[PDB]
Design a protein around this nucleic acid. Structure first.
Ligand code: SF4
Ligand SMILES: [Mg+2]
Ligand SMILES: [Mg+2]
Ligand SMILES: [Mg+2]
Ligand SMILES: [Mg+2]
Ligand SMILES: [Mg+2]
Ligand SMILES: [Mg+2]
Ligand SMILES: [Mg+2]
Ligand SMILES: [Mg+2]
Ligand SMILES: [Mg+2]
Ligand SMILES: [Mg+2]
Ligand SMILES: [Mg+2]
Ligand SMILES: [Mg+2]
Ligand SMILES: [Mg+2]
Ligand SMILES: [Mg+2]
Ligand SMILES: [Mg+2]
Ligand SMILES: [Mg+2]
Ligand SMILES: [Mg+2]
Ligand SMILES: [Mg+2]
Ligand SMILES: [Mg+2]
Ligand SMILES: [Mg+2]
Ligand SMILES: [Mg+2]
Ligand SMILES: [Mg+2]
Ligand SMILES: [Mg+2]
Ligand SMILES: [Mg+2]
Ligand SMILES: [Mg+2]
Ligand SMILES: [Mg+2]
Ligand SMILES: [Mg+2]
Ligand SMILES: [Mg+2]
Ligand SMILES: [Mg+2]
Ligand SMILES: [Mg+2]
Ligand SMILES: [Mg+2]
Ligand SMILES: [Mg+2]
Ligand SMILES: [Mg+2]
Ligand SMILES: [Mg+2]
Ligand SMILES: [Mg+2]
Ligand SMILES: [Mg+2]
Ligand SMILES: [Mg+2]
Ligand SMILES: [Mg+2]
Ligand SMILES: [Mg+2]
Ligand SMILES: [Mg+2]
Ligand SMILES: [Mg+2]
Ligand SMILES: [Mg+2]
Ligand SMILES: [Mg+2]
Ligand SMILES: [Mg+2]
Ligand SMILES: [Mg+2]
Ligand SMILES: [Mg+2]
Ligand SMILES: [Mg+2]
Ligand SMILES: [Mg+2]
Ligand SMILES: [Mg+2]
Ligand SMILES: [Mg+2]
Ligand SMILES: [Mg+2]
Ligand SMILES: [Mg+2]
Ligand SMILES: [Mg+2]
Ligand SMILES: [Mg+2]
Ligand SMILES: [Mg+2]
Ligand SMILES: [Mg+2]
Ligand SMILES: [Mg+2]
Ligand SMILES: [Mg+2]
Ligand SMILES: [Mg+2]
Ligand SMILES: [Mg+2]
Ligand SMILES: [Mg+2]
Ligand SMILES: [Mg+2]
Ligand SMILES: [Mg+2]
Ligand SMILES: [Mg+2]
Ligand SMILES: [Mg+2]
Ligand SMILES: [Mg+2]
Ligand SMILES: [Mg+2]
Ligand SMILES: [Mg+2]
Ligand SMILES: [Mg+2]
Ligand SMILES: [Mg+2]
Ligand SMILES: [Mg+2]
Ligand SMILES: [Mg+2]
Ligand SMILES: [Mg+2]
Ligand SMILES: [Mg+2]
Ligand SMILES: [Mg+2]
Ligand SMILES: [Mg+2]
Ligand SMILES: [Mg+2]
Ligand SMILES: [Mg+2]
Ligand SMILES: [Mg+2]
Ligand SMILES: [Mg+2]
Ligand SMILES: [Mg+2]
Ligand SMILES: [Mg+2]
Ligand SMILES: [Mg+2]
Ligand SMILES: [Mg+2]
Ligand SMILES: [Mg+2]
Ligand SMILES: [Mg+2]
Ligand SMILES: [Mg+2]
Ligand SMILES: [Mg+2]
Ligand SMILES: [Mg+2]
Ligand SMILES: [Mg+2]
Ligand SMILES: [Mg+2]
Ligand SMILES: [Mg+2]
Ligand SMILES: [Mg+2]
Ligand SMILES: [Mg+2]
Ligand SMILES: [Mg+2]
Ligand SMILES: [Mg+2]
Ligand SMILES: [Mg+2]
Ligand SMILES: [Mg+2]
Ligand SMILES: [Mg+2]
Ligand SMILES: [Mg+2]
Ligand SMILES: [Mg+2]
Ligand SMILES: [Mg+2]
Ligand SMILES: [Mg+2]
Ligand SMILES: [Mg+2]
Ligand SMILES: [Mg+2]
Ligand SMILES: [Mg+2]
Ligand SMILES: [Mg+2]
Ligand SMILES: [Mg+2]
Ligand SMILES: [Mg+2]
Ligand SMILES: [Mg+2]
Ligand SMILES: [Mg+2]
Ligand SMILES: [Mg+2]
Ligand SMILES: [Mg+2]
Ligand SMILES: [Mg+2]
Ligand SMILES: [Mg+2]
Ligand SMILES: [Mg+2]
Ligand SMILES: [Mg+2]
Ligand SMILES: [Mg+2]
Ligand SMILES: [Mg+2]
Ligand SMILES: [Mg+2]
Ligand SMILES: [Mg+2]
Ligand SMILES: [Mg+2]
Ligand SMILES: [Mg+2]
Ligand SMILES: [Mg+2]
Ligand SMILES: [Mg+2]
Ligand SMILES: [Mg+2]
Ligand SMILES: [Mg+2]
Ligand SMILES: [Mg+2]
Ligand SMILES: [Mg+2]
Ligand SMILES: [Mg+2]
Ligand SMILES: [Mg+2]
Ligand SMILES: [Mg+2]
Ligand SMILES: [Mg+2]
Ligand SMILES: [Mg+2]
Ligand SMILES: [Mg+2]
Ligand SMILES: [Mg+2]
Ligand SMILES: [Mg+2]
Ligand SMILES: [Mg+2]
Ligand SMILES: [Mg+2]
Ligand SMILES: [Mg+2]
Ligand SMILES: [Mg+2]
Ligand SMILES: [Mg+2]
Ligand SMILES: [Mg+2]
Ligand SMILES: [Mg+2]
Ligand SMILES: [Mg+2]
Ligand SMILES: [Mg+2]
Ligand SMILES: [Mg+2]
Ligand SMILES: [Mg+2]
Ligand SMILES: [Mg+2]
Ligand SMILES: [Mg+2]
Ligand SMILES: [Mg+2]
Ligand SMILES: [Mg+2]
Ligand SMILES: [Mg+2]
Ligand SMILES: [Mg+2]
Ligand SMILES: [Mg+2]
Ligand SMILES: [Mg+2]
Ligand SMILES: [Mg+2]
Ligand SMILES: [Mg+2]
Ligand SMILES: [Mg+2]
Lengths: 342, 96, 208
RNA sequence: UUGGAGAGUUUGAUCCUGGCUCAGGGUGAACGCUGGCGGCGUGCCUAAGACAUGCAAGUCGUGCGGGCCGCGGGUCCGUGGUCAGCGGCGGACGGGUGAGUAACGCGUGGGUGACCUACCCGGAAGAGGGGGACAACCCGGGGAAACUCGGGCUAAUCCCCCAUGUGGACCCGCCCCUUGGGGUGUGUCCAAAGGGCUUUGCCCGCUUCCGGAUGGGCCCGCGUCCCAUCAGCUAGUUGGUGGGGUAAUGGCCCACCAAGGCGACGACGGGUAGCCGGUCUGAGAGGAUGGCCGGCCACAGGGGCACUGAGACACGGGCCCCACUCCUACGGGAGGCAGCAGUUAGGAAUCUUCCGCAAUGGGCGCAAGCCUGACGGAGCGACGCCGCUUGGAGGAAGAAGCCCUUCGGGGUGUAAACUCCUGAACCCGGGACGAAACCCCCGACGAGGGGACUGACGGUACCGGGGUAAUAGCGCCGGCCAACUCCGUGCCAGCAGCCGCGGUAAUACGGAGGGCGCGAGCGUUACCCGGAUUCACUGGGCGUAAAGGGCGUGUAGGCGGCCUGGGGCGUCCCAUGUGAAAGACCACGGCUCAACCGUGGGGGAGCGUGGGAUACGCUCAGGCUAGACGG
RNA sequence: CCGAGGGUAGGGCCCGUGACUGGGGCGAAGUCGUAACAAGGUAGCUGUACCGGAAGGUGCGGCUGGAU
């Protein structure tokens, strides 16, 4: 819908200011917008009608793999969740590079119970899944810098890709930053969209446990070429032989996703819920009353959050509850660190 | 927050005062001349009566009275004084 | 706007030959010459008896699609002659024939009315000097349709004036080849034209 | 004689009554899907809810005197600005809303011998002497502010007195008329103002008086919605008299006397509602309707009120009260968007805090000019209507793909691809009309020529040149009703306006292929009319379908036999006045067409006045016996 | 003097609402019996009065829209 931008206002410590124009990058108050709420996308009248999605992070933290069983009805699976991709854009569906299989991401057990239920009872889907949801991520500690030489010049059929990148640690939750820092043009202009596809394909699997790597920063800066031999299918594997090895060399260390719970247990069963919440790797944050009753709120890693579904029944005689939402990332102790690698 | 309407209101007050003046003396003299017209006191009631008639037309010159208003007040006064002086005559002096 | 759709389906649905592709119609490559049954999955089926409304319905559209005119303007022209004197089931066809784009088609200036419209709309036709790009224009008797000077040098009006070296016009029309100009004589009679349309049924329908 | 269409459904079937429902056309619309352009329209119907800020009525130095300033010097005058103040004129028009009102409020035709009218217009006359005050100004108290108060000086087109009376007004006569109309005689009373320029001259003013013109007031006959489950209502109430008041009649107001006034022809009471031009439907009759535009009325936050005035009992003037809101320095004080935009709430929904005084019109003025949210344009919204574009031509016995299929074939389909052709948009140049008046010059500031200036829209329309194939969506496809198959479903999911569909071969559900209908729109909901001859005047009925009152008597009320005449009320005819404009009707013309817009023609009804006719109805009189009563 | 309004007192109409209640409508594979349509197995309908779990029965008078 359109709306009338009328007064353009700014606010001062002592008074108000009406101005004539607002430049890009800046912010302010505009009067006249009748039916506009926050988080809304405003463009000019005859301008690209685009959403600024921007407000980022869906973000999937549970990995549930699905198997199309046997066999010819695999193309209905990829077409079933396709009806849910434009209908529910929070979870993802991406195949595993190593091990090779589709993993249906999601937000929670109930999120990935209704997708499993509805498909089995509205779309038939010849399938049956596992499935845990431990969906770990891996990243580095110190900056790395390697090379990926993918050269085969002993015959007369292409293959020459020389790609040198700098993988440096980016804070957790920041994501993936790719920049082109070629001095002059030691690599052709066309083989930049395709070297990135070897950097991101190798990042779909890990060196330690085989799970995707995030929170890094690849800086392509130099690399040689051969005019006739170099192919676009020669620089891609050059950007994968330097990503499977940079992150593998420079101090690769583990991380996991923690969740926040709010338990509404009667006060008579508090100490039972508390003591166990900590033996569930818990860091308490405080308690408050509610239905009288009382609510308790802490930080518990997802891995120790499976039995807790029915455990609140074992304790509270069936009088408690919870909610559980993801929060952030950290570094598991070396007791579980050095033992998860198996 | 301005406008000469207050200027206009200022004048109307001055006219209201000057107008409320003449009408009082009109009544004061018209009523007195009719009293002495019941007395008779014949001459002594025309003397006042003339002064009244003047004030009737002096106001009518401006906005204090319309002409019909003057014509009306002049008609009644001459009438109601006459029938009074019909109790005992003597029309002296001039006036009618 | 206008129809801009496929047009040989029309002659099939009507059961008549509504000459509208122009040159293509006379040749035996015409749809009607080949397929007379109406289009669609059940064209060849032996038709079922139409109701009287179906009869009058299939007449009203037959007239419209001959001239190519929207329902609005079609009805307003209809409702005009009715509000006028005389027989409505006549002057209607007159006001249909008094349209500038229809006059351009009968004066040979075009292969088809579909084509004549564009030529009118593209400013290539001036009437009595005034350049008139209005197809909805209504023409009166006493007028001289012509091609513009800056539009006399075109490799398409030529081949249509050259086709009209041989063919003759109707009674109520004048033409001047080489000099590429026309002349509107008078308003026609129901005998002057003989369109495959029983005009009574068109008035017989709108009364409902 | 320019105008008139019906369908489905009660049964096994028939005929009828009769209800139900649909097709049509309409909107200040809105909601769904879709949505390119131009034009002319139009856009808070809900909360007459409350509102931030801005703007919406002001002008004259050719009415007066001051504060300051520039300008020519002898701080004197002159002068130009400028600021308020005094004094004129306007603010009573112009703009908005639809609250209230069932009423002379409106509409229509009159009546005023019961009345008024500023500026404008015409005729007649006149402008001579005197006297006085309040602001500005200085001085002074108080306040945050709003700002007020006190003392003194002073100008005029401000106020006062005397003179003049062509005239006018009033008392009583007296004359013609007939409601208080027109004269005249005597007594009585009243006019005023000056400024300016070129100067024994004009110009704008001023004064009393008669006339026109325009604008009203007041009053009257007729017309004007639902409820009788509202049947009786009324003390200023109805009438007189006297007076008050008003421009003027009047119970309008007041004292008094009288006992009256209204009601089934609907008083009183209740509900709703602004009324007309018109608008829409309709074969007509009738129904519904009152946005926009023109005319009238009413209100200006809710109320009461007077003042000024030519005119208001005053939207942006004043006084008081009440509800609400806000400012504050808490001592106090301010405000009224149903003006133009705008905010907020409510809601299904209704817009730019734009430009211009260039035109038109209004106010002030000698003029220049100044003011003008009236007005002219611009903006927004497919809200409405109207025009236009998304291309034209060639192009297979018919590509691919999808669908159907007796697997022979059929269908989409000349459609596309494809060849030819044109050129929406965009780009470049030119560039409007609306604008010639006021005014300067001649003449005579007259008449008549001649002269310059000014364009918001807008560098828009439109004209020249170049110039690219350039948006298509929606509803239906059982019968009404136009348009058919396939699959999925299995009295499920769902459709449905009516009858009715779905229980494993669904033309009815959802999808697809196919088809019908409309097109920048299409469908839906809400409401008005139509079909409804189903409130029936046109134009229905009542034995059994809904409907004869249980049956008499009789009030008002409706209706009334035969012959002749008087009147002319109904009725009929003519003539005239009226029926504004706009619209509609017909004709033509202006914007490239149209919509839109202009010029001109043509009427009606109904009412006023005058004339006539006399059958029929009425009425006054006379007469008959066929009705009716009676012996 | 009149006067907006304020207040005291007493009335009339309308709307919303109320424990509880009185019937009425739409439903449907019920419980109950089986009144009307055939003389419906007691001819039916009817105004009334009384009684009865319920439809209904009965008394009086009426109607034929009652059969042989
Ligand atoms: S080509 Fe033939 S069938 Fe097709 S529209 Fe022309 S006349 Fe009709
Ligand atoms: Mg504890
Ligand atoms: Mg004020
Ligand atoms: Mg004030
Ligand atoms: Mg003034
Ligand atoms: Mg006294
Ligand atoms: Mg006498
Ligand atoms: Mg064909
Ligand atoms: Mg006709
Ligand atoms: Mg017709
Ligand atoms: Mg050219
Ligand atoms: Mg050209
Ligand atoms: Mg019709
Ligand atoms: Mg005729
Ligand atoms: Mg029937
Ligand atoms: Mg029946
Ligand atoms: Mg049946
Ligand atoms: Mg039947
Ligand atoms: Mg309809
Ligand atoms: Mg819409
Ligand atoms: Mg859309
Ligand atoms: Mg517009
Ligand atoms: Mg409002
Ligand atoms: Mg205004
Ligand atoms: Mg200086
Ligand atoms: Mg000097
Ligand atoms: Mg000085
Ligand atoms: Mg001044
Ligand atoms: Mg005003
Ligand atoms: Mg007005
Ligand atoms: Mg208006
Ligand atoms: Mg209006
Ligand atoms: Mg209303
Ligand atoms: Mg009433
Ligand atoms: Mg009444
Ligand atoms: Mg009247
Ligand atoms: Mg009346
Ligand atoms: Mg009159
Ligand atoms: Mg009068
Ligand atoms: Mg005039
Ligand atoms: Mg003298
Ligand atoms: Mg003198
Ligand atoms: Mg003097
Ligand atoms: Mg102070
Ligand atoms: Mg002070
Ligand atoms: Mg004051
Ligand atoms: Mg003096
Ligand atoms: Mg007389
Ligand atoms: Mg005198
Ligand atoms: Mg005078
Ligand atoms: Mg004097
Ligand atoms: Mg001189
Ligand atoms: Mg006179
Ligand atoms: Mg009632
Ligand atoms: Mg009383
Ligand atoms: Mg009295
Ligand atoms: Mg009296
Ligand atoms: Mg009264
Ligand atoms: Mg008495
Ligand atoms: Mg009466
Ligand atoms: Mg109302
Ligand atoms: Mg009818
Ligand atoms: Mg009405
Ligand atoms: Mg109106
Ligand atoms: Mg309005
Ligand atoms: Mg108006
Ligand atoms: Mg008023
Ligand atoms: Mg208000
Ligand atoms: Mg008020
Ligand atoms: Mg008021
Ligand atoms: Mg007021
Ligand atoms: Mg206001
Ligand atoms: Mg005012
Ligand atoms: Mg405050
Ligand atoms: Mg303030
Ligand atoms: Mg104080
Ligand atoms: Mg103070
Ligand atoms: Mg006080
Ligand atoms: Mg005060
Ligand atoms: Mg307020
Ligand atoms: Mg506005
Ligand atoms: Mg407004
Ligand atoms: Mg709003
Ligand atoms: Mg709301
Ligand atoms: Mg709403
Ligand atoms: Mg709302
Ligand atoms: Mg608004
Ligand atoms: Mg102007
Ligand atoms: Mg003007
Ligand atoms: Mg305007
Ligand atoms: Mg538009
Ligand atoms: Mg259109
Ligand atoms: Mg074939
Ligand atoms: Mg075969
Ligand atoms: Mg075949
Ligand atoms: Mg083609
Ligand atoms: Mg191809
Ligand atoms: Mg072109
Ligand atoms: Mg001027
Ligand atoms: Mg002038
Ligand atoms: Mg002149
Ligand atoms: Mg311009
Ligand atoms: Mg424009
Ligand atoms: Mg040129
Ligand atoms: Mg070209
Ligand atoms: Mg195209
Ligand atoms: Mg093409
Ligand atoms: Mg194409
Ligand atoms: Mg385009
Ligand atoms: Mg349809
Ligand atoms: Mg059908
Ligand atoms: Mg059919
Ligand atoms: Mg078939
Ligand atoms: Mg299916
Ligand atoms: Mg459907
Ligand atoms: Mg049935
Ligand atoms: Mg089926
Ligand atoms: Mg159907
Ligand atoms: Mg279907
Ligand atoms: Mg209806
Ligand atoms: Mg019909
Ligand atoms: Mg009809
Ligand atoms: Mg009817
Ligand atoms: Mg009927
Ligand atoms: Mg009848
Ligand atoms: Mg009937
Ligand atoms: Mg009956
Ligand atoms: Mg009775
Ligand atoms: Mg009798
Ligand atoms: Mg009688
Ligand atoms: Mg008789
Ligand atoms: Mg009689
Ligand atoms: Mg006679
Ligand atoms: Mg008569
Ligand atoms: Mg007449
Ligand atoms: Mg006449
Ligand atoms: Mg007219
Ligand atoms: Mg006209
Ligand atoms: Mg005519
Ligand atoms: Mg033109
Ligand atoms: Mg006329
Ligand atoms: Mg005529
Ligand atoms: Mg006629
Ligand atoms: Mg006679
Ligand atoms: Mg006679
Ligand atoms: Mg007799
Ligand atoms: Mg007898
Ligand atoms: Mg009172
Ligand atoms: Mg009070
Ligand atoms: Mg009271
Ligand atoms: Mg009380
Ligand atoms: Mg009470
Ligand atoms: Mg209850
Ligand atoms: Mg039941
Ligand atoms: Mg029985
Ligand atoms: Mg039985
Ligand atoms: Mg029995
Ligand atoms: Mg009984
Ligand atoms: Mg018994
Ligand atoms: Mg029988």
């Amino acid at each position: 819908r359109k709306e009338r931008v009328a007064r353009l206002l700014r606010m001062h410590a002592n008074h108000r200011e009406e101005v004539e124009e607002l430049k890009a990058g800046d912010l302010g108050a505009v009067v006249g917008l009748k039916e506009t709420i926050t988080g809304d996308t405003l463009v000019g009248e005859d301008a690209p009608r685009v959403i600024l999605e921007s407000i980022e992070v869906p973000e999937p933290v549970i990995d549930v793999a699905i198997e199309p069983k046997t066999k010819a009805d695999q193309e209905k699976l990829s077409q079933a969740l396709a009806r849910l991709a434009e209908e529910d854009p929070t979870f993802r569906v991406s195949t595993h590079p190593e091990t090779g299989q589709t993993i249906i991401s999601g937000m929670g057990e109930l999120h990935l119970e209704i997708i499993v239920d509805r498909l089995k009872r509205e779309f038939k889907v010849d399938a049956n899944v596992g499935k845990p949801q431990v969906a770990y991520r891996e990243t580095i500690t110190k900056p790395v810098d390697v090379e990926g030489k993918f050269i085969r010049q002993t015959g007369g059929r292409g293959q020459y890709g020389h790609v040198k990148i700098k993988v440096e640690p980016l804070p957790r939750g920041s994501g993936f930053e790719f920049v082109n820092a070629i001095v002059g043009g030691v690599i052709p202009k066309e083989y930049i969209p395709a070297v990135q596809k070897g950097i991101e394909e190798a990042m779909q699997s890990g060196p330690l446990i085989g799970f995707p790597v995030v929170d890094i920063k690849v800086t392509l800066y130099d690399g040689s070429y051969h005019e006739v031999d170099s192919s676009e299918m020669a620089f891609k594997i050059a950007g994968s032989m330097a990503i499977k090895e940079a992150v593998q060399k420079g101090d690769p260390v583990i991380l996991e996703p923690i969740m926040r719970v709010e338990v509404t247990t009667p006060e008579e069963y508090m100490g039972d819920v508390i003591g166990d919440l900590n033996a569930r790797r818990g860091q308490i944050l405080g308690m408050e009353p509610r239905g009288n009753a009382q609510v308790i709120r802490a930080f518990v890693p997802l891995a120790e959050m499976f039995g807790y579904a029915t455990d609140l029944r074992s304790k509270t005689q069936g009088r408690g509850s919870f909610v559980m939402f993801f929060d952030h990332y950290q570094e598991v102790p070396k007791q579980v660190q050095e033992k998860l690698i198996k | 927050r301005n406008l000469s309407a207050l200027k206009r209101h200022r004048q109307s007050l001055k006219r209201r005062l000057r107008n409320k003046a003449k009408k009082s003396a009109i009544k004061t003299l018209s009523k007195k001349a009719i009293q002495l017209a019941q007395e008779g006191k014949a001459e002594e009631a025309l003397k006042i009566m003339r002064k009244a008639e003047s004030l009737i037309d002096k106001a009518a010159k401006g906005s204090t009275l319309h002409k019909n208003a003057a014509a009306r007040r002049k008609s009644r006064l001459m009438r109601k004084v006459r029938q009074l002086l019909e109790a005992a005559g003597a029309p002296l002096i001039g006036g009618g | 706007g206008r129809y801009i759709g496929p047009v040989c389906r029309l002659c099939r649905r009507e059961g008549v030959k509504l000459y509208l592709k122009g040159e293509r119609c006379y040749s035996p490559k015409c749809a009607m010459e080949r397929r007379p049954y109406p289009p669609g999955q059940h064209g060849q089926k032996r038709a079922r008896r139409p109701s009287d409304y179906a009869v009058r319905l299939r007449e009203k559209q037959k007239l419209r699609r001959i001239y190519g005119i929207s329902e609005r303007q079609f009805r307003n022209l209809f409702e005009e002659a009715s509000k006028k004197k005389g027989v409505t089931g006549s002057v209607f066809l007159g006001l249909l024939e008094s349209r500038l784009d229809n006059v351009v088609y009968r004066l040979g200036f075009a292969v088809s009315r579909r084509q004549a419209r564009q030529l009118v709309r593209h400013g290539h036709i001036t009437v009595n000097g005034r350049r008139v790009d209005l197809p909805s224009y209504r023409v009166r008797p006493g007028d001289e349709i012509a091609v513009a000077e800056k539009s006399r040098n075109l490799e398409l009006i030529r081949q249509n004036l050259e086709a009209m070296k041989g063919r003759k016009v109707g009674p109520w029309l004048s033409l001047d080849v080489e000099g590429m100009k026309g002349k509107f004589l008078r308003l026609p009679d129901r005998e002057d034209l003989a369109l495959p349309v029983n005009e009574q049924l068109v008035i017989e329908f709108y009364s409902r």
